[PDB]
Design a protein around this ligand. Structure first.
Ligand SMILES: CCc1ccc(CCOc2ccc(C[C@H]3SC(=O)NC3=O)cc2)nc1
Length: 261
């Protein structure tokens, strides 16, 4: 019997709803696919070149896989942007700040949600219809061989927190509404929204994970891991671009990466 708690539950429900609406492949579906539940179908597994050419029925392989990742990332940016607009207060912010928050927030969100599609052995692709093994991704030619490893390392750790979609919905909102982003014009309105989101997240985790002591704090500490993945990725990208002068980068990703840090 607390009305402030009641408003925070209302916010949590709203965010979960928009999340399900914005992201076509949820963690719940991903885990059904990965663990072999009967609600969803088995993926075709790509573990080598033959299986890759087989899978394509249902050029340069490293470059093909890399650009696949890129294209998937641009559609993820599109999904995250539609989600962000559902976050109460976001579209009422200064437009330049909306842009800044998306610019710095989207990649940290991509890697958070990518974890949902991963286990220690590989990653779901093509909306869960495929599974590409971690060893196969590791085996790719020099510059490409290690692009995915840091993401797998983060994911195994992150997934040990056993978050569900209802938790992740609030956490990603919290990520987007970060007042510490470089070049923000009006920090106060953003921190006010984030404070509300943090209250909602704390209550969600206490209610959804009553036996998981300090899960809120542990989750927030993962923001440090996300930030480091993004930094590493950015530097790997600059190596790739200099060594592979014939590989195209999508303009949207290019604009996001422009003087990030
Ligand atoms: C169908 C082919 C295919 C094969 C591997 C993956 C794994 C996806 O892993 C990802 C890795 C990084 C990113 C985002 C990164 S990669 C890039 O070029 N730009 C980004 O922002 C997004 C996804 N997806 C699709």
């Amino acid at each position: 019997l607390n009305p402030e708690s009641a408003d925070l539950r209302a916010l949590a429900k709203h965010l979960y709803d928009s999340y399900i609406k914005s992201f076509p492949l949820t963690k719940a579906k991903a885990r059904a696919i990965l663990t072999g539940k009967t609600t969803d179908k088995s993926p075709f597994v790509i573990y080598d070149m033959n299986s890759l050419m087989m899978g394509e029925d249902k050029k340069e392989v490293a470059i093909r896989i890399f650009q696949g990742c890129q294209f998937r990332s641009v559609e993820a940016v599109q999904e995250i942007t539609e989600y962000a607009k559902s976050i109460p207060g976001f579209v009422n912010l200064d437009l330049n700040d909306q842009v800044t928050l998306l610019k710095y927030g989207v990649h940290e969100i991509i890697y958070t949600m990518l974890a949902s599609l991963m286990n220690k052995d590989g990653v779901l692709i093509s909306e869960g219809q495929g599974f590409m093994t971690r060893e196969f991704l590791k085996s790719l030619r020099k510059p490409f061989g290690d692009f995915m490893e840091p993401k797998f390392e983060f994911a195994v750790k992150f997934n040990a927190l056993e978050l569900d979609d209802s938790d992740l919905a609030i956490f990603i909102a919290v990520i987007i509404l970060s007042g510490d982003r470089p070049g923000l014009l009006n920090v106060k309105p953003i921190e006010d929204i984030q404070d509300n989101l943090l209250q909602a997240l704390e209550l969600q985790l206490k209610l959804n994970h009553p036996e998981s002591s300090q899960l809120f704090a542990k989750l927030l500490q993962k923001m440090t891991d996300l930030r480091q993945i993004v930094t590493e990725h950015v530097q790997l990208l600059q190596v790739i671009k200099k060594t592979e002068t014939d590989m195209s980068l999508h303009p949207l990703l290019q604009e996001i990466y422009k003087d990030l840090y």
